[PDB]
Structures are given as C-alpha cells and as structure tokens.
mmCIF file of C-alpha atoms and ligand atoms in Angstrom:
data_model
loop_
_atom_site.group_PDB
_atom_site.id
_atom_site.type_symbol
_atom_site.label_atom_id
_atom_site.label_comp_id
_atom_site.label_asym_id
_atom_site.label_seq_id
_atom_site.Cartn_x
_atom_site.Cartn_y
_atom_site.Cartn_z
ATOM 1 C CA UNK A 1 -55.054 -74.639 4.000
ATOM 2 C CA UNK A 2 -55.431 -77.964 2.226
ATOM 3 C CA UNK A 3 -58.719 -80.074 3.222
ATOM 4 C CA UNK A 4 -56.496 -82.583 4.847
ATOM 5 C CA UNK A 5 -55.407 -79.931 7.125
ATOM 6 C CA UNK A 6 -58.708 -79.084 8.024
ATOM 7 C CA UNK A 7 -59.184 -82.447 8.649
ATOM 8 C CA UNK A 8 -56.400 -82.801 11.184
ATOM 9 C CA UNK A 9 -57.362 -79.453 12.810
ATOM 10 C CA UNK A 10 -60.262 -80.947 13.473
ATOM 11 C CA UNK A 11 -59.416 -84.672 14.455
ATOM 12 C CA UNK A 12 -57.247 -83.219 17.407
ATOM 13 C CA UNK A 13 -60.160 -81.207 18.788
ATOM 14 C CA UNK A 14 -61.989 -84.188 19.550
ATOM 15 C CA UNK A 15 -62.166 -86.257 22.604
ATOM 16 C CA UNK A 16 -61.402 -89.920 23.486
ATOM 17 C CA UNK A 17 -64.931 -91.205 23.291
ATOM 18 C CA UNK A 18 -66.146 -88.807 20.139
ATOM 19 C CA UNK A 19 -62.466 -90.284 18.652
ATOM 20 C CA UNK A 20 -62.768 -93.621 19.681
ATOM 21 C CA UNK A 21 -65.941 -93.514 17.743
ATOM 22 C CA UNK A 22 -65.115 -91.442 14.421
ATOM 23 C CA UNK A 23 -62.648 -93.264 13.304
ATOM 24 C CA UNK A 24 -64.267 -96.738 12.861
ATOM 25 C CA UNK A 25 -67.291 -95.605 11.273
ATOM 26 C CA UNK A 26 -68.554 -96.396 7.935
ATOM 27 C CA UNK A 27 -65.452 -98.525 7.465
ATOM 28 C CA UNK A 28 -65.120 -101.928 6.568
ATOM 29 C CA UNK A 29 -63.600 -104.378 9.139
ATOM 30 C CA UNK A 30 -62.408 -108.082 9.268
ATOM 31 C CA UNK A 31 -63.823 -110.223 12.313
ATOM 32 C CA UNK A 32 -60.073 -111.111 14.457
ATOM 33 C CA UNK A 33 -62.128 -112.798 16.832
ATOM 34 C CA UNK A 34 -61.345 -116.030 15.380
ATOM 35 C CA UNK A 35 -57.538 -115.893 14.775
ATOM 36 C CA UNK A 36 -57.082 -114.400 18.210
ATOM 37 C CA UNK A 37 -58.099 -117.666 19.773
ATOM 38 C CA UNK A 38 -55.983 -119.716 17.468
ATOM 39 C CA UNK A 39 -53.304 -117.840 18.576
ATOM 40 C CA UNK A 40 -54.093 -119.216 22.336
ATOM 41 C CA UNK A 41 -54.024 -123.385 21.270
ATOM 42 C CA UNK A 42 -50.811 -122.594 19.382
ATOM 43 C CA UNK A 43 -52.711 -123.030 16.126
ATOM 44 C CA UNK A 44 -50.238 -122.461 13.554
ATOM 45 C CA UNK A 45 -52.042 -124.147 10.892
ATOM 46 C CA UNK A 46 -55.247 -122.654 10.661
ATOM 47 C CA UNK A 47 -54.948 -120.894 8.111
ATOM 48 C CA UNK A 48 -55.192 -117.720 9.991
ATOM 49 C CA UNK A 49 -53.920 -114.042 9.083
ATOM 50 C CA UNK A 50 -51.165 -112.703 11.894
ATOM 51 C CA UNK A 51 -52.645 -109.307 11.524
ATOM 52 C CA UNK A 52 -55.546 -107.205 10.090
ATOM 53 C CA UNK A 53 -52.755 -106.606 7.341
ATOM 54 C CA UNK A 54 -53.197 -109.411 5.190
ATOM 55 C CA UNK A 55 -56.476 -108.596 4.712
ATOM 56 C CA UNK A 56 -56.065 -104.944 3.434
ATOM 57 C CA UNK A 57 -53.803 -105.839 1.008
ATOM 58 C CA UNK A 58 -55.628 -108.594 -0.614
ATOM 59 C CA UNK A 59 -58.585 -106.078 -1.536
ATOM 60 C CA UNK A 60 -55.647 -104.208 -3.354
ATOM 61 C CA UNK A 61 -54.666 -107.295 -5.413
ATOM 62 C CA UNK A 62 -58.031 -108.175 -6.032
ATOM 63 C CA UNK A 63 -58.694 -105.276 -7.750
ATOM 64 C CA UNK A 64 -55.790 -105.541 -9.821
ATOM 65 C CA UNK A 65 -53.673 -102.470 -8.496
ATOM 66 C CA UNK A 66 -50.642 -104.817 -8.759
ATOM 67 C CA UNK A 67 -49.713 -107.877 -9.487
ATOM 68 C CA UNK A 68 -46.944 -109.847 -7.062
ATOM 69 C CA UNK A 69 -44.452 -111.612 -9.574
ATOM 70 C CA UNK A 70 -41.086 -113.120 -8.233
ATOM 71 C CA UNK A 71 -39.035 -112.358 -5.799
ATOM 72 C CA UNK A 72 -41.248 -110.026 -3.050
ATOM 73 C CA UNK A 73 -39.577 -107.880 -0.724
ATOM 74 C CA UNK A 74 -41.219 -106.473 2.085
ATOM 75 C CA UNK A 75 -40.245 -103.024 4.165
ATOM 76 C CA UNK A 76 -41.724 -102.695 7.853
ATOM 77 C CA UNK A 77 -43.230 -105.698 8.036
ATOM 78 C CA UNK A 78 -44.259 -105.649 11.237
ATOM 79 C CA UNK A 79 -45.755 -108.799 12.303
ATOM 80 C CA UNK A 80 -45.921 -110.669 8.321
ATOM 81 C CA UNK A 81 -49.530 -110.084 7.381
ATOM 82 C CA UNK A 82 -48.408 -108.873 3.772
ATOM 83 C CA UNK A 83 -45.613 -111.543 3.510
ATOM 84 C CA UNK A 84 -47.718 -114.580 4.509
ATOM 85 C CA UNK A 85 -50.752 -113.264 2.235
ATOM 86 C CA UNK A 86 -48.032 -112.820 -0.894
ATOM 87 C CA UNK A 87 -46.801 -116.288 -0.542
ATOM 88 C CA UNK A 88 -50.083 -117.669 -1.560
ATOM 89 C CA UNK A 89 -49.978 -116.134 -4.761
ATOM 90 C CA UNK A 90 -49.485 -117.559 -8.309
ATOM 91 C CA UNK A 91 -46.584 -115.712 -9.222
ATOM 92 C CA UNK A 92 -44.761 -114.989 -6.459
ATOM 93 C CA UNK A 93 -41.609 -117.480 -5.794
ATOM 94 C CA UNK A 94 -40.169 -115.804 -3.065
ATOM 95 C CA UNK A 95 -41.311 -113.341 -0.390
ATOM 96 C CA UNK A 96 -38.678 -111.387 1.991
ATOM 97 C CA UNK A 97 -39.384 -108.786 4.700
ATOM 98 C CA UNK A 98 -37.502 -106.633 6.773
ATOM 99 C CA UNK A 99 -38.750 -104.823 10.128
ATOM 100 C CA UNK A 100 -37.367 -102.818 12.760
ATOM 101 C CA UNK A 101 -38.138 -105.116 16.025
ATOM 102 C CA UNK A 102 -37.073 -104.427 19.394
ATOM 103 C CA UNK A 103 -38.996 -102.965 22.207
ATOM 104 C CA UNK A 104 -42.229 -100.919 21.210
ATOM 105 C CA UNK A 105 -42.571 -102.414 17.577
ATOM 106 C CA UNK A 106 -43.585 -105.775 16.601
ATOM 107 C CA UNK A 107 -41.866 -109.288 15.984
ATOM 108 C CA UNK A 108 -42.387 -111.273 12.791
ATOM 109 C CA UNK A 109 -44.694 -113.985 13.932
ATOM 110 C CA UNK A 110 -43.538 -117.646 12.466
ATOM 111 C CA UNK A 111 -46.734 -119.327 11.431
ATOM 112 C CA UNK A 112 -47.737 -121.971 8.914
ATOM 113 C CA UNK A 113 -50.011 -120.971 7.034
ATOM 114 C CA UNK A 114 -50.323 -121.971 2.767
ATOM 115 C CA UNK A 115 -46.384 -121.394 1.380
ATOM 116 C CA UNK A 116 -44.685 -119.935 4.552
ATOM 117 C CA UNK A 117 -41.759 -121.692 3.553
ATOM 118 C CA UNK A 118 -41.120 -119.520 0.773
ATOM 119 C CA UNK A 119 -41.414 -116.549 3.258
ATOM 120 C CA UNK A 120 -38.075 -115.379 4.950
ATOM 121 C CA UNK A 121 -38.353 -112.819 7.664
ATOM 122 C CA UNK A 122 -35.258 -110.544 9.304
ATOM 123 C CA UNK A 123 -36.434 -108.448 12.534
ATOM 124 C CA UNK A 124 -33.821 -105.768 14.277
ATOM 125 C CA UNK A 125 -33.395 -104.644 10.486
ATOM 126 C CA UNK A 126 -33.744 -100.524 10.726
ATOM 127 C CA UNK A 127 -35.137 -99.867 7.011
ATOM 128 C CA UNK A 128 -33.900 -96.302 6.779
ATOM 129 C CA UNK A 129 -30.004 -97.545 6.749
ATOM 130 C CA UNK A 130 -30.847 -100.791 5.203
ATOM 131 C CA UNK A 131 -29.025 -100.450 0.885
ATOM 132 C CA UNK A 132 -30.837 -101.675 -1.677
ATOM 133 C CA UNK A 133 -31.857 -104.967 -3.074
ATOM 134 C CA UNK A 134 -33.377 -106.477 -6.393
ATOM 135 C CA UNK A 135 -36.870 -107.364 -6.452
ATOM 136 C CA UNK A 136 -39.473 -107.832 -9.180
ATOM 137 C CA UNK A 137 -42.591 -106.251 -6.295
ATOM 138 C CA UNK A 138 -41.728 -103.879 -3.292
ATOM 139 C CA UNK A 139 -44.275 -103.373 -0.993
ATOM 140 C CA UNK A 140 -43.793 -100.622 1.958
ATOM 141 C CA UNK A 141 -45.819 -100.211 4.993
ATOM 142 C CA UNK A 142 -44.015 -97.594 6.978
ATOM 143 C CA UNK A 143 -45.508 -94.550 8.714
ATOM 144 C CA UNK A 144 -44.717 -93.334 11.739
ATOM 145 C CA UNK A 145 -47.750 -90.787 13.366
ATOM 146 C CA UNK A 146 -48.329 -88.088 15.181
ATOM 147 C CA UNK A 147 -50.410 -85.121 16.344
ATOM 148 C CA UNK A 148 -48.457 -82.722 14.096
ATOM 149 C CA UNK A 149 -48.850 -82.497 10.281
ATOM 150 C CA UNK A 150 -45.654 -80.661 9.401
ATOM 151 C CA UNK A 151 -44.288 -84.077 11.516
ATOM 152 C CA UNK A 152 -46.302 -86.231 9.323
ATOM 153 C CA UNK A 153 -45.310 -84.357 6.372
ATOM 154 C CA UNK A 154 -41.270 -85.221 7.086
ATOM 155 C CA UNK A 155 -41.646 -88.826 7.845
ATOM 156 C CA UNK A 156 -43.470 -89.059 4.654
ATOM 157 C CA UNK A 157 -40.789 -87.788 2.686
ATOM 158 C CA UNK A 158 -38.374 -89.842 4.455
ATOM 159 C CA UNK A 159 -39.866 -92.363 3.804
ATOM 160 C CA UNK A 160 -39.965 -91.709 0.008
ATOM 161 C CA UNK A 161 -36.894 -90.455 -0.629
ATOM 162 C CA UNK A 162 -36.418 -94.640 1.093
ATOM 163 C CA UNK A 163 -38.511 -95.956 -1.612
ATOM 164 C CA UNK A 164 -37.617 -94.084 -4.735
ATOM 165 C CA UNK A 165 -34.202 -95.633 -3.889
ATOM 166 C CA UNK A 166 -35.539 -99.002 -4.093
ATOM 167 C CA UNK A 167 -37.028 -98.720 -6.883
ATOM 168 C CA UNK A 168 -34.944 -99.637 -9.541
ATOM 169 C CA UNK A 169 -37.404 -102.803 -10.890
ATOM 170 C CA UNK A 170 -38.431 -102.593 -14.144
ATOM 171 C CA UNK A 171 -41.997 -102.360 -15.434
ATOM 172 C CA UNK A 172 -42.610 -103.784 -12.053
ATOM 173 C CA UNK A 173 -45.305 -104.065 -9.084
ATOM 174 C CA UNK A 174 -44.986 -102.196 -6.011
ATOM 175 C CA UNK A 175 -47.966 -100.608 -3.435
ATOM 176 C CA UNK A 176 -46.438 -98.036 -0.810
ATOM 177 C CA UNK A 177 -47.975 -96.594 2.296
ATOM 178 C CA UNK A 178 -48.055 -93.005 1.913
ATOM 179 C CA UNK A 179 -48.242 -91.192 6.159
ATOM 180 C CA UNK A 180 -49.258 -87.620 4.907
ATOM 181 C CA UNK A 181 -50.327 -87.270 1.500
ATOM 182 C CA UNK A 182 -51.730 -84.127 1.841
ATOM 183 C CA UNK A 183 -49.018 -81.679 2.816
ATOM 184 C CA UNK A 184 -47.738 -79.795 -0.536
ATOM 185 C CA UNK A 185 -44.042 -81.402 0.357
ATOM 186 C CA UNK A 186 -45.934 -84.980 -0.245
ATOM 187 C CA UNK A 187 -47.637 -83.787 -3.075
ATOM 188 C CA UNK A 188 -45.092 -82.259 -4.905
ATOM 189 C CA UNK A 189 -42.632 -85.491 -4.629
ATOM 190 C CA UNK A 190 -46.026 -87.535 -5.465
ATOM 191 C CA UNK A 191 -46.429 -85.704 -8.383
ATOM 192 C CA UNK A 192 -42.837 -86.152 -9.475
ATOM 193 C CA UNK A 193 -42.276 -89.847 -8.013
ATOM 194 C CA UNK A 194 -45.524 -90.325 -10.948
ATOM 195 C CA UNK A 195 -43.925 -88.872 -13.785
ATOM 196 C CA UNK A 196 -41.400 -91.477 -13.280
ATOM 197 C CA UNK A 197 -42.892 -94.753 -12.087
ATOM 198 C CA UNK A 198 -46.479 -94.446 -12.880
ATOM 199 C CA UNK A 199 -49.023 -95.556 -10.692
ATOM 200 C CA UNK A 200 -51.477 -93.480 -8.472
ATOM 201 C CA UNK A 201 -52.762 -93.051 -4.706
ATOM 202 C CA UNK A 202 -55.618 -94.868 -3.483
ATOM 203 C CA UNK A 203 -57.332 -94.514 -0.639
ATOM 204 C CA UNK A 204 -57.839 -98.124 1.103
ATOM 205 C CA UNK A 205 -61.639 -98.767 3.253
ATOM 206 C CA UNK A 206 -59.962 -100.716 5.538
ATOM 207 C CA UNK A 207 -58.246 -97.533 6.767
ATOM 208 C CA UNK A 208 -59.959 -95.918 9.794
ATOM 209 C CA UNK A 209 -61.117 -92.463 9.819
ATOM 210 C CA UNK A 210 -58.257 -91.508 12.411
ATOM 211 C CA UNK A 211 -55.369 -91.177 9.202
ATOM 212 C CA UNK A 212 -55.372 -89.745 5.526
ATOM 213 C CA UNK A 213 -53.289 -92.622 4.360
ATOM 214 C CA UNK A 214 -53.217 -93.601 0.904
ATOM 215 C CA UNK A 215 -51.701 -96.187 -1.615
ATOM 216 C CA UNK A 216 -49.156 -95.495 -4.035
ATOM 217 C CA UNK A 217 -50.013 -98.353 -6.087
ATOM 218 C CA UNK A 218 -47.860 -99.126 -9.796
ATOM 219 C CA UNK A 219 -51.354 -100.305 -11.340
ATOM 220 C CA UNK A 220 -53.293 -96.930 -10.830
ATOM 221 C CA UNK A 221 -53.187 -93.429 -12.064
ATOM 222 C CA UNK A 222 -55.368 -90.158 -11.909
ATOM 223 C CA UNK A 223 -54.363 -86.287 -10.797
ATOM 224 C CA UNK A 224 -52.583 -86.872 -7.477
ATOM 225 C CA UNK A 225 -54.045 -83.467 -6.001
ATOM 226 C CA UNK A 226 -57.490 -84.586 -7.096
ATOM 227 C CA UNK A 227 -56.407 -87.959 -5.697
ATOM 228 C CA UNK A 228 -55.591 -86.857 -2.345
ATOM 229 C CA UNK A 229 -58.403 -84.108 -2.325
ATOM 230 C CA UNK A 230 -61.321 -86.007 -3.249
ATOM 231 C CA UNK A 231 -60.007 -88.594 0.242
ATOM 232 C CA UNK A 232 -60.166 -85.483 2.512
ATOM 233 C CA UNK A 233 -63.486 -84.744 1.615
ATOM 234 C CA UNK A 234 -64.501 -88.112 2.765
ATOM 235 C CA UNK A 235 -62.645 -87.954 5.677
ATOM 236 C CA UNK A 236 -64.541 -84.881 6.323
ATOM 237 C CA UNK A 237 -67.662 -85.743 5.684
ATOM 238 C CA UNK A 238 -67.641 -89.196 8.091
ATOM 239 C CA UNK A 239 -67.586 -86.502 11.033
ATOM 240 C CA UNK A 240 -70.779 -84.857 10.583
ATOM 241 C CA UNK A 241 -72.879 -87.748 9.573
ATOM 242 C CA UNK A 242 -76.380 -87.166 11.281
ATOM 243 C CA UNK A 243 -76.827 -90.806 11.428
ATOM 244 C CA UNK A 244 -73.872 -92.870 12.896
ATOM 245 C CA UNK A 245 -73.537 -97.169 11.991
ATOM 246 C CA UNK A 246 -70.625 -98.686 13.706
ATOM 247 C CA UNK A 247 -68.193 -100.366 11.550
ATOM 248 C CA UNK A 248 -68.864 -102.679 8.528
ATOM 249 C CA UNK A 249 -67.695 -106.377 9.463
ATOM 250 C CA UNK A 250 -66.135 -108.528 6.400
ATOM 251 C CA UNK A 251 -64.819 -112.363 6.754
ATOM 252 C CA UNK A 252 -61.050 -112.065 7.157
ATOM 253 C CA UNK A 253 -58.916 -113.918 5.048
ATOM 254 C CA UNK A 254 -58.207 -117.162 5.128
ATOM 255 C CA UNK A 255 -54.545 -118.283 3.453
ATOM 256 C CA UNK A 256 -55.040 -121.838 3.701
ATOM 257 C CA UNK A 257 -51.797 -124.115 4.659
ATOM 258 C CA UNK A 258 -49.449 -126.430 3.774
ATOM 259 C CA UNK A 259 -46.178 -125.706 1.602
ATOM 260 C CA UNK A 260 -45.547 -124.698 -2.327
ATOM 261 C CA UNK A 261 -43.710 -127.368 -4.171
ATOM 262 C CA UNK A 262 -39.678 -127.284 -4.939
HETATM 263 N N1 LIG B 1 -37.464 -97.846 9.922
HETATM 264 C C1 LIG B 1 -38.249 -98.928 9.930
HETATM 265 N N2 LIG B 1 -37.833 -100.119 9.393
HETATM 266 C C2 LIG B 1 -38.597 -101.255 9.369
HETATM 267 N N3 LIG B 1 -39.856 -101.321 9.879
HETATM 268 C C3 LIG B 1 -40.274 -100.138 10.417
HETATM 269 C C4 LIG B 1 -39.566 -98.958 10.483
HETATM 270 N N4 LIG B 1 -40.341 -97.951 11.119
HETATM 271 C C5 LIG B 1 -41.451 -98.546 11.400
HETATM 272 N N5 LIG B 1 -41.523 -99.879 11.020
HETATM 273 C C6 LIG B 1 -42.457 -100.834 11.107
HETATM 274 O O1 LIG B 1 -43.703 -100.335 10.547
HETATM 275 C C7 LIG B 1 -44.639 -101.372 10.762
HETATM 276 C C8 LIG B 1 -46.039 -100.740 10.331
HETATM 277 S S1 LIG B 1 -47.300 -101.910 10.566
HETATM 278 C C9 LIG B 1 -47.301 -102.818 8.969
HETATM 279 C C10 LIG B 1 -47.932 -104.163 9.235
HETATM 280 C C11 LIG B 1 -47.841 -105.237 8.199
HETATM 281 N N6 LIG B 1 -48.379 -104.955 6.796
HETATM 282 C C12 LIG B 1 -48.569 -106.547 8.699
HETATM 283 O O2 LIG B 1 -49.401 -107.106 7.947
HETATM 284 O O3 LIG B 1 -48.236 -106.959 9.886
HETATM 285 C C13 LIG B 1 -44.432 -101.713 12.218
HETATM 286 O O4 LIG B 1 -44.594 -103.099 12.447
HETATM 287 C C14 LIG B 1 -42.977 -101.181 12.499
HETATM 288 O O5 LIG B 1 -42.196 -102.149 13.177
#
C-alpha cells in the first residue's frame, strides 16, 4: 500500500463535520468575499478573478515553474480563472480555452478584466474527443473525483494519455493537473511522461486536504515517487494535528482591466 492509499483509506472513514474540517486546514486561502459581490452589481470591470483558479496558478508562475509565451491554450477551463489570469502576462499574445459546459459543469464567464480581449473561450467542447492544436503553453485542469482510487487512478491516465497527445510544443511551458498521482499506473506513466518532457510534480497549498493533486509543471524536476511520497506524508500528517488553525487567508488576485494594445 502506497501512503496515498492510506491516505484515502482514511479520508473516507471520516464524517461530514470531521471532513468538512480536515480538508481546509493549514491551507492557504484567497478572501472571495469581495468578487462575489461584484458579481451581484454586474461589475465586470473590477478587476476581479471568476474563480479561486486564477489565484492558484499565479503562485505557480511566480515561482517560475513556467513561463506563459504565445499562443495559450487552455483544457477544462471551467469558468476562465487560468485564461483571464494568462492574459495579463508579458508574453502571452493569445489565450484559448476549451470546456465541457452543459448541465452539472460550469460556463465560461465573459468578464473584463486587464486583456480579456485577447482571451477566446469555446464551452460544449468535450476535451477527450477534441484533436490537437499548436500552442507554445498548455495548461490542463481536468480531474474528475471520486470515492474510489482505482477510479481515480483511470481518469488520471485518461487524462494523460489526453495530454501527452498535445504535447508536441517544443522546449515549451505547460502545468497539468494530475487526479491520482499516487497509484503505481500514475506513477509509472509520470515517470515515463518525465523522461520525455521534463518537468516535475508539485504539490500546490492552495489545494485542500480533501485530494492528493499535484502539478506536472515543465519548469520542475526531482524523483517523481519521492515527489508524490513526500505529499502523502503531509496529507497525513494534517489529520492528526493536536492543535487545529482554520485556514490561512491570502489577498486574491487582482488582474486589473482594460485591453492589450493591437
Ligand atoms: N472532458 C472535459 N473537457 C473539458 N473540460 C472538462 C472535461 N471534464 C471536466 N472538465 C472541466 O474541468 C473543470 C475543472 S475546474 C478548473 C477551473 C479553472 N482553472 C478556473 O480557473 O475556472 C470543470 O470546469 C469541468 O467543466
């Protein structure tokens, strides 16, 4: 048993309040409170994140673990929080998302926040029979969860085997969610999807407690197992913390407005 599995074992043998609580703790968290009631006055130029997404992929960026240059495409992009946060980069000339819409999932929210114009986003677009494009930075947020681990396990590799296909870039910029990365299945295409694009997993603290997710990232790099391993321990250890503080509350982003010349 792998200390991920342990950790989902364990997870499911909680209850609604004990869960409820778990998995915000210790992590960090942006204050919504403010873009929620922009929302309400049709405030569309605010300068306002649609979603807590945004914000979990600038502390990516601004650590360097990529680099968005050219044209950015987008997979699952829900309602646009990595889309809208990309076109506000230096250079990044042209952002593009795709996301599955319909009932149940979200709708790309049209706001107008710093370069939106740039920003083209298709809903109704099912990623897993969408072909390939040309872009200079993929990003992928797709993950589908459940209670079962041999579940997670498949959707990861689904997913994957979606990416790897994509990727066809160059020495180029890309951060992927990865569902499970703790089943051997995961790791094993991990390890090989390294040996042949670089880059690493990294656990991101905007995460809550409740998933093992974990960024493939093309700036980053160390022993996947270790990687993955070293996550699960954490994971583990934020349930039997004597002393329990609520979550940590960050500013969220704030992307400005207006448009981005020619
Ligand atoms: N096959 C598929 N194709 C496209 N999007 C998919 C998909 N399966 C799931 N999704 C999308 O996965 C998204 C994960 S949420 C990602 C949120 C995004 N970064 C933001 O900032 O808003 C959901 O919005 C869901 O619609």
């Amino acid at each position: 048993r792998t200390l991920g599995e342990v950790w989902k074992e364990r997870l499911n043998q909680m209850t609604k309040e004990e869960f409820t609580r778990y998995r915000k703790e210790a992590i960090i968290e942006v204050d919504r409170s403010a873009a929620k009631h922009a929302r309400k006055e049709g405030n569309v130029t605010g300068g306002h994140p649609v979603s807590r997404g945004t914000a979990k992929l600038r502390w990516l960026v601004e650590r360097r673990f990529l680099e968005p240059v050219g044209k950015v495409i987008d997979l699952g992009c829900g309602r646009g929080g990595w889309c809208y946060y990309m076109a506000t980069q230096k250079r990044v000339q042209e952002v593009r998302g795709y996301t599955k819409g319909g009932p149940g999932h979200e709708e790309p929210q049209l706001v107008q926040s710093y370069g939106w114009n740039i920003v083209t986003m298709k809903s109704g677009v099912d990623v897993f029979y969408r072909p390939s494009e040309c872009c200079d930075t993929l990003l992928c947020d797709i993950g589908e969860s459940s209670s079962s681990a041999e579940v997670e396990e498949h959707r990861t590799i689904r997913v994957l085997e979606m990416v790897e296909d994509w990727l066809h870039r160059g020495p180029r910029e890309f951060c992927v969610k990865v569902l499970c990365p703790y089943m051997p299945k995961v790791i094993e295409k991990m390890e090989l999807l390294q040996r042949r694009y670089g880059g690493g997993l990294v656990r991101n603290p905007l995460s809550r407690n409740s998933t093992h997710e974990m960024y493939w990232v093309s700036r980053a790099s160390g022993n996947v197992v270790h990687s993955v391993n070293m996550t699960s321990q954490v994971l583990l250890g934020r349930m039997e913390k004597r002393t329990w503080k609520g979550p940590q509350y960050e500013e969220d982003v704030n992307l400005g407005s207006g448009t981005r010349a020619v």
